[PDB]
């Protein structure tokens, strides 16, 4: 019940400054007891594929923290992550590919299709995602 203004700002906020301020407030408030991050799953999924850089980075960090606190929610970020890898902007796909190792370690059940789409984007799209998938395969043994 105490998270009403934050949700209202995340839903009614349209400018970059308000969303950035709300995300920074949530990040600084989630230092200890990150269970509250489980109450902003939909907002983080919507702000994950954002055109901004700082807001997208904060959303990715919050999502990774929430998945590390409770891995059971790691299966809920499957579609919204794939949309980050299949976008025609070249901006969010870079952050998605950088966070690919941690998300693949936290998933442990859908890492195959994640790495498959990563290699497909790296082959068709002009880039070199060698180190990321290498670290993913080394950690997954």
């Amino acid at each position: 019940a105490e998270m009403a203004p934050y949700m209202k700002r995340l839903s009614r906020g349209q400018t970059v400054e308000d969303l950035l301020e709300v995300l920074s407030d949530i990040d600084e408030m989630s230092r200890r007891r990150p269970e509250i991050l489980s109450f902003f799953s939909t907002n983080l999924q919507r702000l994950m594929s954002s055109a901004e850089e700082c807001c997208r980075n904060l959303a990715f960090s919050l999502a990774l923290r929430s998945m590390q606190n409770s891995p059971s929610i790691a299966a809920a970020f499957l579609p919204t992550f794939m949309y980050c890898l299949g976008s025609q902007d070249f901006e969010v796909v870079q952050t998605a590919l950088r966070n690919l190792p941690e998300y693949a370690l936290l998933c442990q059940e859908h890492a195959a299709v994640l790495l498959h789409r990563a290699f497909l984007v790296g082959m068709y799209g002009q880039m070199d995602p060698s180190a990321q998938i290498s670290e993913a395969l080394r950690i997954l043994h």
């Binding site: 009403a4 949700m7 209202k8 839903s11 939909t42 907002n43 919507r46 499957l78 579609p79 919204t80 794939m82 949309y83 299949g86 025609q88 859908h110 299709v113």
Partner: protein
Amino acid sequence: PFLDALKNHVGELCGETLRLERKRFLWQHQLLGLLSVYTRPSCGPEALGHLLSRARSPEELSLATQLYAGLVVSLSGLLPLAFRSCLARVHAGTLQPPFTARFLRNLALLVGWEQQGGEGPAALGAHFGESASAHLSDLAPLLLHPEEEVAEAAASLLAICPFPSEALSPSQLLGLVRAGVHRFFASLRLHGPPGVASACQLLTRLSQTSPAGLKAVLQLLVEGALHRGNTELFGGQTNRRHTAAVPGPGGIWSVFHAGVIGRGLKPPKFVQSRNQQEVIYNTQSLLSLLVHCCSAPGGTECGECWGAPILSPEAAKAVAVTLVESVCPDAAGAELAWPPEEHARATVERDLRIGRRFREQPLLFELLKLVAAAPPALCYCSVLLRGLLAALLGHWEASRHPDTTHSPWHLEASCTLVAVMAEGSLLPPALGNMHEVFSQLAPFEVRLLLLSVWGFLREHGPLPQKFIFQSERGRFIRDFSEGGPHLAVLHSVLHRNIDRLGLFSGRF
């Protein structure tokens, strides 16, 4: 806590609502609506996707429409989020091919119901087409889906899905054109003629948006029907055995032979014998698609009752250009001015390769019939005509048979070429009678007539000028300011064979 606990069962709740029971479905739908109004994320996109993903009868679509009408008074912005969530689930492992096919066909039905009508989509502002037009980048890769159901559903959806306020993006436009031509070719391969309506409609709708899109559509359609693949659809195309029979049957001397040269006895030796029927109908469908693409709109009831739409000169010019680029990419003699006859003795290899390309794929001739419709279009596709005429001249010069019927394909190609270059507003009807009387003419006589054709085309060259526009219609009329010596040669050829071409004289 009741709604907070029921929020984690929206899937099974929608599954029970879609059972179409007596009274339980109404109460469950009201519960779904109250749960969507209560919670802050509103569960709008998720519930709408769960409803539209497993809908088979129009009752489920009506229930979804009622839910949206009940939620639109309290919430806002449900279609974009629902479509985004559904597409993100489709691109992921969720939403199995049957589920996504059902969702796509339900979305297509909703768009179709929103397009027509004056009371349904008017009393309930939803904008299905406007909300679906913002997802053409995600709906494009679904046209080439390996599952036929999902591909057909996406084709039926994109055939009626409108475009956004902006025209289109070049990347999105090229992707849509490629996906559409791939779906058209795949449906012609699998379904055939009666299963291409969606692809033709989509291509005709997106080709009339911009000249660049039309040119890209025409180029890709021409290049796809002439590639090594999909060309048989329109026109057509180790030691044990060596040890059991060794030692030369003597076990004391060497082998009888001295080795092999290559391999010998080529295994494949396959000949094109697919089918005769149902092959020309694919060409008919392709020509109908091309006509729908080039014909400018179109549909204003011209004339009194026999309005015939003209062909756009730019579209036919692009078709001729891509045809020339596909047949012979050479440019050593691509000038519009016809060189002299002796000049044809140096580029015999190009003419022979053009003749081979024409004999391997007859569809090219049909494509010429599309270029000969527009008057100024055939003036650009002159390299193909020149090469074909030179090849025919070289064949008739080295023909020992006294009758033309010994070479049927060459005579057919000669008549077809002359008819094409005559109906393209380039030759008088005397040439139309010449290719008619070609049926029973001597080989050297046909060669001399084609040489007179070459001379006339060298004198009166096909050029973009001398095709002034008319204030009546869009047709380009060519006013001949005809050939004296050419008509004299034709009359002499006709008079030397009066004993068989007597009735053909009175026609001209």
